[PDB]
Amino acid sequence: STIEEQAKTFLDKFNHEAEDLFYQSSLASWNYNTNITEENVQNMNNAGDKWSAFLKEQSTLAQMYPLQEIQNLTVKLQLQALQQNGSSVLSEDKSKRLNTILNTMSTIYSTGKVCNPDNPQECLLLEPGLNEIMANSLDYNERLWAWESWRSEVGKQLRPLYEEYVVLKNEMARANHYEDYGDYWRGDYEVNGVDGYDYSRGQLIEDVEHTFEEIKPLYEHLHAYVRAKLMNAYPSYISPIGCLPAHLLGDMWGRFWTNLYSLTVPFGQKPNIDVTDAMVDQAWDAQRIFKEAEKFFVSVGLPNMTQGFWENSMLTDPGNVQKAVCHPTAWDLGKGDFRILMCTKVTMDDFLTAHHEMGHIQYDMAYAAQPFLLRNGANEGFHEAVGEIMSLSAATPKHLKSIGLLSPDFQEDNETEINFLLKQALTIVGTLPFTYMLEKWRWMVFKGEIPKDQWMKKWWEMKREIVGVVEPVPHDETYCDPASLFHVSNDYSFIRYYTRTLYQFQFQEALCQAAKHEGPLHKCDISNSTEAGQKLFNMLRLGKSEPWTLALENVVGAKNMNVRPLLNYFEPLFTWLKDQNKNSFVGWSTDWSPYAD
Amino acid sequence: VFNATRFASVYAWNRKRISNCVADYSVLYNSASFSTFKCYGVSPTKLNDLCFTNVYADSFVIRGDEVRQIAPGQTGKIADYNYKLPDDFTGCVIAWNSNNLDSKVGGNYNYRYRLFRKSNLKPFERDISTEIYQAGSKPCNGVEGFNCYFPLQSYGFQPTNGVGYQPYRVVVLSFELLHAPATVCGPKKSTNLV
Predict the structure, then answer these.
(1) DSSP character at residue B84
(2) So which cofactors does this thing need (chain A)?
(3) How many angstroms separate the Cα of A47 from the Cα of each of A20, A40, A41, A50?
(4) Residues after which chain A is discontinuous, using a C–N cutoff of 2.5 Å
(5) Binding-site residues of A
(6) Could you give the CA distance from residue A388 to residue A376 in angstroms, rounded to a whole number?
(7) B74 with B81: CB under 8 angstroms?
(8) Nearest to A10 by CA among A48, A60, A49
């Protein structure tokens, strides 16, 4: 009778057909990752191409239902996914050129290599070699060569390719009623048609800007500590008041200080938690680690896993003839079928990674009852943030002591806590302003405020101001550093890490309050707290049928990112970093560089 | 009907009449060869003490989640457009997971069901028509499109399906106490001759 029946019937028709077509591509991907063969990768691409063609043809009837006078959010969100044309707005030549650019940028980045001036015959590739040079090797010369030559060999070549990527993408975004491809990424958190929970696209730039200055009191204290510790290792290059060189950050892109833990050990004579030997002593296997991991998820109050879940899961690599992808990956094969791929070993590193992948399944299995177009996450943050809160609680010694891995005689004090807490801040606190730095720079490039010739010029300016990092060698207008990143070259959004990082502590503080945990959050443990899992599952089941702000309002007490639980987790760390900088300078001075003279 | 070689579709549900025989109802209760078993009005073990006029067995295969719709006072795609029971349903329902028997790689397309219908069915009504569900005033001309939809669709009964999507061989046992004399009753006990 009414027009609403056309949308309800069309989405039901799409939800019936797209459900089976997508699982054929998802299950085909499972077969490839479990057995890397020419036959599996072909059917994987064919199935994905099949479902891809179905999405384009279905946009015909999706656009014939105007949502101008429609109040039903369920009908609006589902059709908006199909009404968008995306890359089909431009001609095939412009779209084919974009894939040719992305295919070229991925090849230049993946096949990038740096070789020494004194050993042209002996040198390494991007992975696994040059990653260890910035991570493991402590030589000033090897770290400097790996950084500088990488910018010249890979950074320069990706500069002209990144231009066509930004230009072609802005045409695609602008055709879909956007300001630029930066605004296209910001539209993931877009909300409209819901009173009290709407959200504009430009609000994300204000949130990361407001939360960044809120992170500065914690980051400025840790940066002086990391500078003071690295100054003792490299006193002839690092000033006590200056900036940290870019090649001494711990990686080939300057995102994490996780590799600088050996140079920034707070107490090198105190112990830490490690149940690797404990698991081997009790004859633990990859199956028992996953089984005992499931004991934590039921204790907190979340649903259990099925029999086909564990029986069809992967726990190792089945030989080299049928070598599988050992990367941790939570799969949703569909029709109630969920599985995980992981080559688990007996160690604390894989113990927490297993909980991380199981946390992902708790996300997808929750909103499995939603329609197919709404059987997805509300945003990028909710997907990966929920996985970290589950692994962090398991890493707490209160849980390991309960299961019986960590002995009960293990003494705990403020000293041993700071080693675990400070080591985390190298990952969290030492990365949050970098994501805000990179995405703010990229967002300005998409909008077009920064000319293409001023990419490296403004990039060096933003580094000294926002993060307080300086290059080892000055770069001219021909260089392009952030183009050499995996996420940038492969057309990904890195802002999800900033939102995921803050959302992680937001959900943690909400569940720690549900578990009635008092004090800082780094000692929090939701084990054996049935109310904690119940509070989480109420948020996981929403999927993307309701506003993401409403998921935060009823759980974490806010509608956007926030830094309040960040200080609560790192509360005693701030006092520690407040003390250690009594012989250093909090913050940084942009006038210093390692090549100064 | 509980172990038939092949079952009928949901919208095309078949029916088998039971009469003129002795019907031991406690067999299936104690068989433990089912996934769900629930009777309305009468306990399953008490049916052997009752005689009836006519008893029908409506057989079909559904998904796991759709089993909740087969009951008095329910609604949904299957209860309304495919197979409806009356509010006074005092029969029984047996279900048995047949994923190891009926499921097929790619999905068993022979078991289909209706998603949309111009009007809700009656109790024990069956409709196997292919009329296009018309939402608007324009004619469909026998092909779906804008405000036109093909109402019948196939099931995805694949071996990788979950509990809510796997195939379940379901049979509905409706009893009838009419003015006519009885035709089927349960077995009566016996003992030695003293």
Answers:
(1) B
(2) Zn(2+); chloride
(3) 11, 10, 10, 5
(4) none
(5) 151, 255, 327-328, 356, 360, 384, 459, 463, 497
(6) 18
(7) no
(8) A60
Sign of torsion over alpha carbons A309, A359, A494, A204: positive
Nearest alpha-carbon partner for A221 in A415, A422, A419, A417: A422
CA distance A460 to A458: 5
CA gap A522, A575 in Å, rounded: 14
Strands B21-22 and B184-185: parallel
In chain A, the residue whose alpha carbon lies closest to the alpha carbon of B138 is A1
Give the 3-state secondary structure percentages of chain B, helix then strand then coil, rounded to 5: 10, 30, 65
Buried b (16+ CB within 10 A) or exposed e, A115-148: eeeeeeeeebebeeebbebbbeeeebebbbbbbb
Q: Strand locations in A196-283, DSSP E?
A: 244-245
Residue A55: partners with Cβ closer than 8 Å, 6 or more residues away: A18, A82
- What residue ranges in B9-149 does DSSP mark as E strands? 14-18, 21-22, 36-39, 51-52, 54-63, 92-97, 112-114, 133-134, 148-149
Within the 63-102 window of chain A, which residues sit less than 8 Å (CB to CB) from chain B? 64
**Resolution of this entry in Å?**
3.6
Are B143 and B132 in contact by the 8 Å Cβ rule? The answer is yes
β-partners of residue A332 are A338
Side-chain-facing half-sphere of A80: CA atoms under 13 Å:
20
Instruction: Give catalytic status of residue A5 as yes or no.
Output: no
User: How many beta carbons lie within 10 A of that of residue A359, not counting itself?
Assistant: 25
